[PDB]
Amino acid sequence: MNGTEGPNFYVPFSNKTGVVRSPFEAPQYYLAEPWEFSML
């Protein structure tokens, strides 16, 4: 959480992945809200 984005922008993977979680690691593990301010 912290943020979430959850509902929005074409599944919120679509936007700030490249920005915040560039490599990217998170998509393989948890397509939820890890990138959007959560960090966890």
Curated annotation (Swiss-Prot):
Gene, per the UniProt record: RHO
Subunit structure: Homodimer. May form a complex composed of RHO, GRK1 and RCVRN in a Ca(2+)-dependent manner; RCVRN prevents the interaction between GRK1 and RHO. Interacts with GRK1. Interacts (phosphorylated form) with SAG. Interacts with GNAT1. Interacts with GNAT3. SAG and G-proteins compete for a common binding site. Interacts with PRCD; the interaction promotes PRCD stability. Forms a complex with ASAP1 and ARF4. Forms a complex with ASAP1, RAB11A, Rabin8/RAB3IP, ARF4 and RAB11FIP3; the complex regulates Golgi-to-cilia rhodopsin/RHO transport in photoreceptors.
Portion of the parent chain present: 1 to 40 of 348
Annotated glycan sites: 2, 15
Domain of life: Eukaryota
Lineage, uppermost ranks: Eukaryota, Metazoa, Chordata, Craniata, Vertebrata
Topology feature Extracellular, residues: 1-36
Modification N-acetylmethionine occurs at: 1
UniProt effect for mutating residue 2 to C: Stabilized by a disulfide bond and normal light absorption
Species of origin: Bos taurus (Bovine)
Protein name per its UniProtKB record: Rhodopsin
Known role: Photoreceptor required for image-forming vision at low light intensity. Required for photoreceptor cell viability after birth. Light-induced isomerization of 11-cis to all-trans retinal triggers a conformational change that activates signaling via G-proteins. Subsequent receptor phosphorylation mediates displacement of the bound G-protein alpha subunit by the arrestin SAG and terminates signaling.
Tissue specificity note: Expressed in rod-shaped photoreceptor cells in the retina that mediate vision in dim light (at protein level).
Sequence similarity: Belongs to the G-protein coupled receptor 1 family. Opsin subfamily.
Coiled-coil residue windows: none
Compartmental location: Membrane; Cell projection, Cilium, Photoreceptor outer segment
PTM annotation, UniProt: Phosphorylated on some or all of the serine and threonine residues present in the C-terminal region. Contains one covalently linked retinal chromophore. Upon light absorption, the covalently bound 11-cis-retinal is converted to all-trans-retinal. After hydrolysis of the Schiff base and release of the covalently bound all-trans-retinal, active rhodopsin is regenerated by binding of a fresh molecule of 11-cis-retinal.
